[PDB]
């Protein structure tokens, strides 16, 4: 039978069938529960909502993400999310399909072990596999060499790969992703007069981010231009009809990716992280890595992100190096597309962990 | 000349001179307009009353606060309040004294800009400065490391400070303060048959809160005790001789600080807010923050607030660490006391914004 | 057995059986007592009268309402009213039917407790329930979302409901209803030369109000028109044959709903109260509340009330909001109709308070 590919990231769940071109189900990884007292009898009032249903009813619900920074924090909510994905979105029998999951690098072992246990026991899947997302991004890109920069909702990581060989010592992970930018934007909108404090309001700020934010090619000159003119301002309409005007906050939000000190982090920017990762590799490899910077994930969808990354890397790298950044139009689903490609390959069918192997050797099999 | 310190709170105005141990002028931030029509011609009736005189005449006036949630909403009323405090209360010429003002963190920029514009253009103050209330609360305590929980009439906030360095990424703010507690007390007093609907009766309810409310160490135990005996009931005499008895309303009102869901907000209580602020800081300074939990502002004056907060934080924080809450007797005036200390230091005499600087750099100077 | 539904409002008693389309008995909530000396021994003078009996004999009686502003103030008279309703109007044995009662939100707790105690220990009902009138209005309107503006004889209240979840922190209430308009009309009619001072004449004035009053779309323009022409005047014939002409008093009376200052109240009009209640709800809720303004109760029967409400709300709310007001032709009995619908639902039969629960828990059970 065809295999399932479920890229359950921090922000969105992308699920589908191996070999299919694009994910079939794409819904936010959200579980909402009512925060008010019900007064009308019956009328189909459920005790919890998941995915797109929770988004529609977010006015009366308190929304919680089961995954934070790529680590599952509430396993009941995660079981709920997987149950939704399999039964209501895909509408398939889990026991009929082997499922391919994904995980970020440098994650706790207990996370993967518990995920495997839930998949085999609660859903009775025949076989499963857990893959590193940055590796699947390269499969999606259709090349075996390059340094992937995957930036989702929870984590940002770099994974150099050369001729199909990974370099685990050069893997970099940065706990700063779309959610932190959303929180910074929430903080930064207050100085202009708007207050967004509830979980539901945090979803409006995320939409403002996804619609109006962009990366400035030169931060100081952009700030000066914004201060000296209103040409950069845009307007956005809230669900209740109130209209807000956002100015230099448009590019100050994603600028946190390059200056994490804006949110009090001591780490370096994504450009510095990629350059450091490249320099961790052997001297004979760096030339090929400079020319194959593959970007992935939703957070790399800001306008001007690729140009800013290229400018910064060219500044850090020595001249005579051909810095080139590959930004496919479908970066958002590149991890899922790669998972689809990987699960279809004939040479991969031996990598599945069958339930026999799992139960005869324990959860630790998933670390092989 | 001696500087002026004016702690423009959202519920009270506290003004005085730098160096004094207590503010000279303390009156409610209130402006009242007559709502009936006069019939007597020989009186010196005037169209607006401010401060104490508005409280004395509240029967025939519609009282309205110009400041809500630390944000000035009516600028004509605020100008009237400032004129009153400068001339009728302090009896000074503003042009002869530098003025130190205060504000809550995460406020709109336009608020500071307009405050500075009014201070320089209307009152012709020679120089002025706008400080953050929580920072001055630390000066009032003499120490330089601690996490300040300032809770006034409109806004509650946390500000962690370590060795004189503020950690702005850890600042927290709730729009839940004495005003909301007064409104909730008005709501729940109806359960016993008492109806307060007018703005002048809101002041009566505020007095009831200030005189009879207290914080329960264990909320459910008190709820059980109240239902079991009348030992908790107290009587209050209204301005017209009526006597009203309130029971569990005494500690249900301030409980809203720890369970904001009582008023429909999904925010976390003040204990959770301070704990989260501490955990936003570096692991190496948390031990010092836990031991220097400072309180300030009027709403931190409920009996048993300190013990309840200590118990809650001790529950949240790991053991083997000394949770200690500093609740001085002068919590109400701590912000103004600190502002008095700061305005007198010889090291601060170069931080004033001079009229010469302002009238050439523009209103944006106040954000330095 | 069939359940009884009794809507004990301040003005009228509407009683009937669940499942019927309209109330069976609708009579004023009046108790009259003779105020002169009987001189004919043979006649059945009778010591007190109730409902229509009192209304038809109002010439020799002094009429008293046991309910004032939705609160029962004379419990003997209310027991008399209920005895009339059960035995003379419906002609049923109350011990054979469960009864569904109603009351306004934010009422004193003792009101429900005394009501339950009288119902269980005096009439020996098998089970009973006490609902919120604004909630039953939605059942009658057959929808799950909306903000109900219920305005009867004693009390006006707003209750936002979303997907069957009530927002009790946004519930508003005004003590300004049909009775206050009747009193204002009595006062206003004096300036034209008509004096109505007795209780029996209050009923004539109430009839005049029901017959001739209407809401002006633009109050100032209407006042200007009436002062320049007699086209707006109408004539009314009193019981003794005197004819009185009424001019701009026709629309000045119901204008008190929008300008409570006419009767000395500083509260906001019903339009402002509805808008404020909407703005108390979460920003994702407001779109639906604006489109489902539900009106119920007698005082919402003034011609032009719906158009005036729509115009005022449109003025207050932001543009691009589809403000719509639902005004069923049976607004008067919407609360009773909803109670009938609710009491007949199978899913509701678990919510009855059986007398066993009252015995083993006392009156306190009714607050769960």
């Amino acid at each position: 039978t065809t295999a399932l590919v479920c890229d359950n990231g921090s922000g969105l769940v992308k699920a589908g069938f191996a070999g299919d071109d694009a994910p079939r189900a794409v819904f936010p990884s959200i579980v909402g529960r009512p925060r008010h007292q019900g007064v009308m009898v019956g009328m189909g009032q459920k005790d919890s909502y998941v995915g797109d249903e929770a988004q529609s009813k977010r006015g009366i619900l308190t929304l919680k993400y089961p995954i934070e920074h790529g680590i599952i924090t509430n396993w009941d909510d995660m079981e709920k999310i997987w149950h939704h994905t399999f039964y209501n979105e895909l509408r398939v029998a889990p026991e009929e399909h082997p499922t391919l999951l994904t995980e970020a690098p440098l994650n706790p072992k207990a996370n993967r072990e518990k995920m495997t246990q839930i998949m085999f026991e609660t859903f009775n899947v025949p076989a499963m596999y857990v893959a590193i997302q940055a590796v699947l991004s390269l499969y999606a890109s259709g090349r075996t060499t390059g340094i992937v920069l995957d930036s989702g909702d929870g984590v940002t990581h770099n994974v150099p790969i050369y001729e199909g060989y990974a370099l685990p010592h050069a893997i970099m992970r940065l706990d700063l992703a779309g959610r932190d930018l959303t929180d910074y934007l929430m903080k930064i909108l207050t100085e202009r007069g708007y207050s967004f404090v509830t979980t539901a309001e945090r979803e409006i700020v995320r939409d403002i981010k996804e619609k109006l934010c962009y990366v400035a090619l030169d931060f100081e000159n952009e700030m000066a231009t914004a201060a000296s003119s209103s040409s950069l301002e845009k307007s956005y309409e809230l669900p209740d009809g109130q209209v807000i005007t956002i100015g230099n906050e448009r590019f100050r939000c994603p600028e946190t990716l390059f200056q994490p000190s804006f949110i009090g982090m001591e780490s370096a920017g994504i450009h510095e992280t990629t350059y450091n990762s490249i320099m961790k590799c052997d001297i004979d490899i760096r030339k090929d890595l400079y020319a194959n910077n593959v970007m992935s994930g939703g957070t790399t969808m800001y306008p001007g992100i690729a140009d800013r990354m290229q400018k910064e890397i060219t500044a850090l790298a020595p001249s005579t190096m051909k810095i080139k950044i590959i930004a496919p139009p479908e970066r958002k689903y590149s991890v899922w597309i790669g998972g689809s490609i990987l699960a279809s390959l004939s040479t991969f069918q031996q990598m599945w962990i069958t339930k026999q192997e799992y139960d005869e050797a324990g959860p630790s099999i998933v670390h092989r | 000349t001696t500087a002026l310190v004016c702690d423009n709170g959202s519920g009270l105005v506290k003004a005085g001179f730098a160096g004094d141990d207590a503010p000279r002028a303390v009156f409610p931030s209130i402006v009242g307009r007559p709502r009936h029509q006069g019939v007597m011609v020989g009186m010196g009736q005037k169209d607006s009353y401010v401060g104490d005189e508005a409280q004395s005449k509240r029967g025939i006036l519609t009282l309205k606060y110009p400041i809500e949630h630390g944000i000035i909403t009516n600028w004509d009323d605020m100008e009237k309040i400032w004129h009153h405090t400068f001339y009728n209360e302090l009896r000074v010429a503003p042009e002869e004294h530098p003025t130190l003002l205060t504000e809550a963190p995460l406020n709109p920029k336009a608020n500071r800009e307009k405050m500075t514009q009014i201070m320089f253009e209307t009152f012709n103050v020679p120089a002025m400065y706008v400080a953050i209330q929580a920072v001055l609360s630390l000066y009032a305590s003499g120490r330089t490391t601690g996490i300040v929980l300032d809770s006034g009439d409109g806004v509650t906030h946390n500000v962690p400070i370590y060795e004189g360095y503020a950690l702005p990424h850890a600042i927290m703010r709730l729009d839940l303060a004495g005003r909301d507690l007064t409104d909730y007390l008005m709501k729940i007093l109806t359960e016993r048959g008492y109806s307060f609907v007018t703005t002048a009766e809101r002041e009566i309810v505020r007095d009831i809160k200030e005189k009879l409310c207290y914080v329960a160490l264990d909320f459910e135990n008190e709820m059980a005790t109240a239902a079991s005996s009348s030992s908790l009931e107290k009587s209050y005499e209204l301005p017209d001789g009526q006597v009203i008895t309130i029971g569990n309303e005494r500690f249900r009102c301030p409980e809203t600080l720890f369970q904001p869901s009582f008023i429909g907000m999904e925010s976390a209580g003040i204990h959770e807010t301070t704990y989260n602020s501490i955990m936003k800081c570096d692991i190496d300074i948390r031990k010092d923050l836990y031991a220097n939990n400072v309180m300030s502002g009027g709403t931190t004056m409920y009996p048993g607030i300190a013990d309840r907060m200590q118990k809650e934080i001790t529950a949240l924080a790991p053991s083997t660490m000394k949770i200690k809450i500093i609740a001085p007797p002068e919590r109400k005036y701590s912000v103004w006391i600190g502002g008095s200390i700061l305005a007198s230091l010889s090291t601060f005499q170069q931080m004033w914004i001079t009229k010469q600087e302002y009238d050439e750099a523009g209103p944006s100077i106040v954000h330095r | 057995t069939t359940a009884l539904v009794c809507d004990n409002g301040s003005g009228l008693v509407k009683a009937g059986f669940a499942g019927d389309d309209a109330p069976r008995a609708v009579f004023p909530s009046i108790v009259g007592r003779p105020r002169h000396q009987g001189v004919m021994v043979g006649m059945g003078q009778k010591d007190s009268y109730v409902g229509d009996e009192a209304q038809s004999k109002r010439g020799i009686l002094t009429l008293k309402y046991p309910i004032e502003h939705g609160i029962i103030t004379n419990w003997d008279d209310m027991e008399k009213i209920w005895h009339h309703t059960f035995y003379n109007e419906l002609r049923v044995a109350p011990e054979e039917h469960p009864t569904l009662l109603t009351e306004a939100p934010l009422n004193p707790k003792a009101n429900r407790e005394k009501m339950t105690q009288i119902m269980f220990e005096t009439f020996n009902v098998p089970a009973m329930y006490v609902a919120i009138q604004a909630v039953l209005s939605l059942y009658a309107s057959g929808r799950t979302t909306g903000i109900v503006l219920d305005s009867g004889d004693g009390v006006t209240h707003n209750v936002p409901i979303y997907e069957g979840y009530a927002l009790p922190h946004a519930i508003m209430r005004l003590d300004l209803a049909g009775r206050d308009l009747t009193d204002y009309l009595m006062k206003i009619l004096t300036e034209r030369g008509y004096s109505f001072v007795t209780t029996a004449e209050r009923e004539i004035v109430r009839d005049i109000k029901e017959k001739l009053c209407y809401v002006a779309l633009d109050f100032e323009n209407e006042m200007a028109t009436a002062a320049s022409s007699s086209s707006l005047e109408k004539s009314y014939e009193l019981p003794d044959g005197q004819v009185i002409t009424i001019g701009n008093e026709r629309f000045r009376c119901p204008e008190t709903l929008f300008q409570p200052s006419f009767i000395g109240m500083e509260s906001a009009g019903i339009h402002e109260t509805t808008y404020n209640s909407i703005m108390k709800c979460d920003i994702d809720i407001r779109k639906d509340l604006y489109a489902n303004n539900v009106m119920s109760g007698g005082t919402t029967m003034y011609p032009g009330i719906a158009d005036r409400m729509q115009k005022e709300i449109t003025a207050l709310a932001p543009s691009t909001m589809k403000i719509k007001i639902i005004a069923p032709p049976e607004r008067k009995y919407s609360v009773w109709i909803g109670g009938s619908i609710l009491a007949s639902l199978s899913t509701f039969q678990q919510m009855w308070i059986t007398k066993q629960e009252y015995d083993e828990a006392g009156p306190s059970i009714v607050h769960r």
Binding site: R192, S195, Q242 | - | -
Partner: peptide, 7 residues
Amino acid sequence: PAWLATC
């Protein structure tokens, strides 16, 4: 309330 957008 007393802000510019929400609250």
